[PDB]
């Protein structure tokens, strides 16, 4: 076992997490099996508390587990699958050594925070790192620990502890410190104290750095390397610069210029490490990808516009894994992304009573769509403009993904405007008026990784040839309201078919709409399951109908 | 007495010297008799020793006291005369202590740093607050301290310690501390961690805050401010904003905008000062005059460009003191002022064998100017180009100004050019040559301020018109070399006539050059008498003539 | 090269200067050619300024150099003869540099405290290092440096800053940190947190440790250790306990069986380091004479007695190296030593008109003892019970030795009491009087190593026996007034007869009383140069002959 441990910062608001879910990118072409942890300060359990407005989307795991956000970045830029133990959290880790007081297990001794509580933190990431990630039950070779907060706080004081017991406890040599840091500019000069007085604490706290990760807004002087490399002990070559470049996929391939495996191959001895050839090719292959669709970047033009319509779009990060899983459909079909906020609100009638340029702007952006998206919202204030931008989709053949409540809207607009019951409902939001068009149902809660299975017609489906005709499909769910299973014979009957459903036949799951270029509803969630290189296949779907050449999208598929 | 210690800094860098010498202007209004205090880190004993490349120009008080540059933004912003003790140096306090142990003054005991030196620090700071700076001898009401470097170093460390002595050796309500802070933006957050990082550092060196004087990028949020006041235990009316603003004259009305008058006289008790009318009736006055120049300031649009002739200008802190006189000199005029940066060797003819484009652009930006400078250089590298536009701006007819050196190439210029002895010669270059014809003589040092006195038929100078036709003058001096007195019966022939000279009739002040709107050499230099209310009269006849309109700025000077 | 920096504390008397003299010992018994540099925080250039009273005695180098004690603690346990520059100091490095900057050597940059002066620290202890200090010029293999003050202060500042710095201007192997510290007792338990609050603060000033040397009252408990082990970096075998045993001589055999030796042989690979047969050989041979005396002071029982006669006798510090010589020339005769404190004021007649108690007490302490000595007092007030103790010695025939004012009272003594007069004087004290009978001279200043030749008959002389009967003694001095050489013809006919002169014959330095058991005078200082192997010739006549067998010392000494 191997560990590098991502930390630091003057400020928490540096971003860490690039520089955690790209160094463990760095280390997977090496072929290692590489898995990350992610450390919150936060006293949350887990993430499903707490609502998308308050730093960002509700993410979900395999397990249901309802997550941090940066447990994604790790999932998308590593390939791996994730289980809710792996966010370590000071709601969890208190949760976990009180409930076991009440139970008993420290034979009725003082349980200290120092010596008992820090010792299961260290027990935590030893269990954690054991745990398989990857297509086959192999136990990871390398993990990435990103500590979340700063070294240096009171929300932090557990882990930093916790750590210096760790950097013995596992040998030094299989462990390593990432240390980023703030290096200001003012009035032209870059200013290295902020650094300089948090080495100071990392020391103090005990852990010893090994690269000084700076998010200056710059290049770094070579006087400012030499000065860095004079007051933390690191080498020059060790003082790495993590300055923006034209897409965050870069980030990787800069790591490698600054010869960041070769000092980590070194750091940790992983030549010792025993990899076999389907290992070592199937890294420098991936390597290859990572240089390939970076280079694709670099020069693709053709610009592709998706409508993203919903409520609470100024909170871009409530959406954070929709708007992923869109960069790698984008960067597969070689076009180049823009996406048209649709603040689905302003789409409804009653706006031009309120603000004229809000309804004209909304329409705008809907209309110069190539393709659209209904993003799985949350809540139900919004509604109306998602059904209109659905109607609009249908009518003006304009390519077409609903995302869970996505499907949900779509099944309403096609009872309302092509059915003909222009009373039917979200059972979601118009509950107690008890109406007899409800097309949904609540069936108290869904979560996790759960099988869907293609209905026996299927053959034609544009989304089953996305799937690659396979007769299954596994993909992370959230529901409590699904479509009212006594409206499907009729919507079946009208070109609505429902291509998948649940393993019982009872609950309906996917649909593609006969005749149109390309209309689906999910009612999972396909976000979370696109990779940087493998883009989620409704995903992929809509930025290839959208670019034009759906039909050679499924020949790279299916060949 | 009363002292305000300005102070703090997560970064050295973070601009500490305007909030001093703009805290003491806003105390001024008052009526006060300020006073100001800078503490450099640094072991220079005085700034002599350090070239004007090594951050920035050489300073000459009155004293002849080669010193920091802040000194001078006190006495330009306060109106005050300093001596050489008001610079607090490492240098300075540990040569004195370490002087005084081989004098035997402790008696044989151990002269820890503790107790004793932190006990001279204290000393000194009180000694040097009870100095007369005024145009009266009367004592201090407030001292404004600038304690250079941070608080949280290893070269700021016995003034901080001494400066927690000296918040109990005087009594609080004589004592206040105002600590400037970093406030960085990052992904468009205001980040107060770097602030909370020096808050906790200040209180445990033991000082205790009263004003968070933030350097932020922009307007501090509500919310911003309120965090900063839990953190630090200051009220949110008190965390005072130092933004960036039309020019650095504004900067005092900032503050006063921000309460910060009614805040100090509050903190310190300033309504129990004894002051007369003639104190607080000139105090109001003064601010006044402020609102004045600087509304003045806000809506002058009619540009007067200066072109400043010498080599480094590439260094503009090796200027300063020529920079600032010329905004005073400026904003009295109501012309609004452009400096042209002419770096002198690229005049000389030998730069068109090397790069035409700087040949072209140095003798452009020259062409152009509206008026002429050549501000009293050092070293002698550049001096044929600083010849060149002398002969420009006699021939060409061109307001001039020669500070210094300035004067020196104006006669060097006379005589090979209107005299005809084309071999004359600096003899602060070309010395072991022992040619006759040399326009200059080394005659070791001669420093600080001295007395000019007008030769009697100078009537009709220009210059003397802009002194008030005053019979003699004090200003400050720096030159090991003067002009050979052996010329100047020829160049008083020749119309080039000495205006004023030192009270022993043999060495050469002042010369004005009859028949030319106005070309003036002064070899005192009258930069650093300069106040932000009071412009030095050869700087402000040199934007005068450029602006036209000298013959209404004698009027206003004479009445 | 190598070093072992010697550091640290909660509190800063927790006595580090048995650990740096007996860890620069254990590594002399390899046979290294060990030195040592000493830190004082203090701003002292050299301690000639600071009186006996103010933390102890005025310590003198063969240079002159007027020094602080803890050189002469190194001297004597390493054998080493050290030079004023191994005393480095806050005095000294801040006047170094302040007088380097008006010598202009930084050409004029700004001399900042980091960067510049902690880079002359970084370069005077690597000057210092390879000056020679044993009996041939050969550089030293490892240095010893003890870090006066403590880490985590404002006077240890700049060396701690240096010192990091070290640690890599110097590789690591090349360097160890040896931290001393605190671990208090409190109801009966061992309290760690002292400690682990300066093992956070030595990481944050940056240089890490490799030893952590508590000064418990007690034996550490394994879960001490275990604790210490865990908060700390170190193995548990590396938390050295340095409690109080029998003699100081003791503890480097406490360190040896704690096995600091085969730990810093490792940490420092001393294996590497090219060593001789008679570098090695030397080294075992040293052992066994430690382990040889230390053996002989664990069942040593034969008491001897030694009246020290003196001023402030309870400041006993004012006399460290008079103890510690004795303490050598014990250890040899293999007789346990008692001194006796006589206050010589006591002595006086007039004493019996104050407080008869203590005219008893000191008579009766001076009666009690073996063997009398005249310690090389300061000032002049107690100076007739320095002369009536002189009396006693004489004519009750006790062993009697006079160091510096020691030779001078017995010359003023054996002036009253057997040449017969009572009115001469001391021109020390009495000057004004004019007197002819005077005693003395002055002759401005006389410091350092001086030789001393023996006058030709003196081949009987005790003293002359204990020197091996050599022809010029090398040996340290200080006096500024010396006996009166017009009356030496008096006393040599009288049987006072001087044995010892300075080469120019004019200067008299060594006196033997002809027809007593053992009574001398030497008017250099014997103390400074004895060794613990190798005590001080006329200290190791006066503790043998107060034991009885000075005949078999002179066989031991000649064969
Ligand atoms: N590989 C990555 C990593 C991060 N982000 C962006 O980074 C964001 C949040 O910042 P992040 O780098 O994750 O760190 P912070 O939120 O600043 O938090 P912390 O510094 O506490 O880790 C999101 O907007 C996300 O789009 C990204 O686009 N690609
Ligand atoms: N740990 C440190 C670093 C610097 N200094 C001193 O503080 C002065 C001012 O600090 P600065 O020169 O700004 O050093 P930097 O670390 O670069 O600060 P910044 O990065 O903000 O520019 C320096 O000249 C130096 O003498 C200090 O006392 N302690
Ligand atoms: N009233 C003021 C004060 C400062 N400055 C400008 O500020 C400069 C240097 O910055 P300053 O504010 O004096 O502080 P720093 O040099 O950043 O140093 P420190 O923060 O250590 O005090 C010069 O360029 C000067 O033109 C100014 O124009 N007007
Ligand atoms: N002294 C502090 C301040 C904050 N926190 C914790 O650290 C988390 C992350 O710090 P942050 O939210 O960024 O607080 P700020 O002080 O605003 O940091 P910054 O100014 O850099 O945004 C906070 O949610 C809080 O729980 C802490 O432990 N100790
Ligand atoms: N080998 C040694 C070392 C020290 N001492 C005694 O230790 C004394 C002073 O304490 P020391 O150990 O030298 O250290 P401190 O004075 O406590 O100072 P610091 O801790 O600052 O080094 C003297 O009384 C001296 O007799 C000794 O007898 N033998
Ligand atoms: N660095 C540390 C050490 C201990 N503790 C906590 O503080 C409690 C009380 O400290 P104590 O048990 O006394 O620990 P020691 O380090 O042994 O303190 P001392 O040596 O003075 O007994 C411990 O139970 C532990 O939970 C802590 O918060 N931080
Ligand atoms: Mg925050
Ligand atoms: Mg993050
Ligand atoms: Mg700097
Ligand atoms: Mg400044
Ligand atoms: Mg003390
Ligand atoms: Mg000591």
């Given at each position: 076992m191997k560990y590098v441990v991502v930390s630091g910062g003057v400020?928490?608001?540096?971003?860490?997490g690039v520089l955690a879910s790209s160094t463990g990118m760095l280390l997977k072409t090496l072929g290692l099996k590489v898995t990350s942890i992610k450390i919150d300060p936060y006293m949350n359990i887990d993430a499903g508390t707490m609502s998308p407005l308050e730093h960002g989307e509700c993410f979900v795991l395999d397990d249901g587990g309802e997550t941090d956000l940066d447990l994604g970045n790790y999932e998308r830029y590593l390939g791996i699958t994730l289980s809710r133990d792996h966010n370590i959290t000071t709601g969890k880790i208190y949760s976990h050594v009180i409930s076991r007081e009440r139970r008993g297990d420290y034979l009725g001794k003082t349980v200290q925070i120092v010596p008992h509580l820090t010792n299961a933190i260290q027990d935590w990431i030893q269990r954690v790192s054991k745990i398989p990630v990857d297509d086959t039950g192999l136990e990871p070779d390398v993990c990435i620990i990103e500590l979340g907060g700063?070294?240096?706080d009171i929300e932090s004081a557990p882990f930093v502890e916790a750590l210096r017991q760790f950097q013995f406890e596992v040998g030094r040599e299989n462990f390593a410190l990432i240390h980023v840091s703030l290096v200001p500019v003012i009035h032209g000069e870059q200013k290295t104290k902020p650094t300089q007085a948090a080495i100071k604490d990392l020391r103090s706290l005990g852990l010893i750095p090994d690269m000084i990760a700076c998010r200056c807004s710059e290049e770094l002087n070579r006087s400012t390397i030499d000065k860095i490399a004079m007051f933390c002990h690191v080498g020059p070559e060790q003082v790495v610069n993590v300055h923006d470049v034209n897409s965050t996929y870069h980030v990787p391939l800069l790591l490698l210029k600054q010869h960041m495996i070769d000092y980590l191959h070194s750091r940790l001895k992983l030549g010792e490490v025993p990899l076999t050839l389907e290992d070592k090719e199937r890294g420098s292959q991936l390597l290859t990808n990572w240089e390939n669709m970076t280079k694709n970047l670099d020069d693709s033009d053709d610009v592709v516009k998706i409508a993203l319509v919903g409520k609470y779009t100024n909170l871009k990060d409530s959406y954070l894994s929709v708007t992923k899983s869109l960069e790698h459909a984008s960067m597969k079909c070689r076009r180049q992304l823009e996406i048209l906020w649709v603040e689905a609100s302003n789409l409804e009638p009653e706006t031009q009573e309120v603000d004229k340029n809000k309804f004209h702007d909304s329409w705008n952006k809907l209309s110069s769509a190539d393709g659209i998206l209904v993003p799985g919202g949350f809540g139900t204030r919004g509604i109306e403009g998602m059904i209109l931008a659905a109607k609009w989709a249908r009518e003006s053949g304009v390519p077409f993904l609903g995302v869970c409540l996505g499907l949900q809207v779509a099944a309403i607009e096609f009872a309302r405007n092509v059915i003909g019951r222009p009373n039917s409902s979200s059972t979601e939001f118009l509950d107690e008026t008890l109406l007899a068009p409800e097309d949904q149902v609540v069936i108290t809660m869904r979560l996790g990784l759960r099988p869907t299975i293609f209905q026996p017609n299927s053959e034609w489906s544009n989304i089953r040839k996305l799937y690659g005709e396979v007769n299954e499909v596994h993909e992370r769910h959230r529901h409590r309201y699904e479509i009212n299973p006594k409206i499907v014979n009729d919507m079946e009957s009208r070109g609505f078919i429902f291509v998948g459903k649940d393993e019982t036949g009872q609950r309906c799951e996917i649909f593609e709409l006969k005749g149109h270029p390309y209309y689906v509803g999910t009612q999972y969630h396909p976000e979370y399951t696109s990779k940087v290189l493998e883009p989620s296949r409704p995903f992929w779907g809509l930025v290839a109908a959208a670019s034009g050449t759906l039909g050679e999208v499924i020949k790279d598929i299916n060949l």
């Open positions: 400020i928490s608001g540096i971003g860490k700063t070294v240096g």
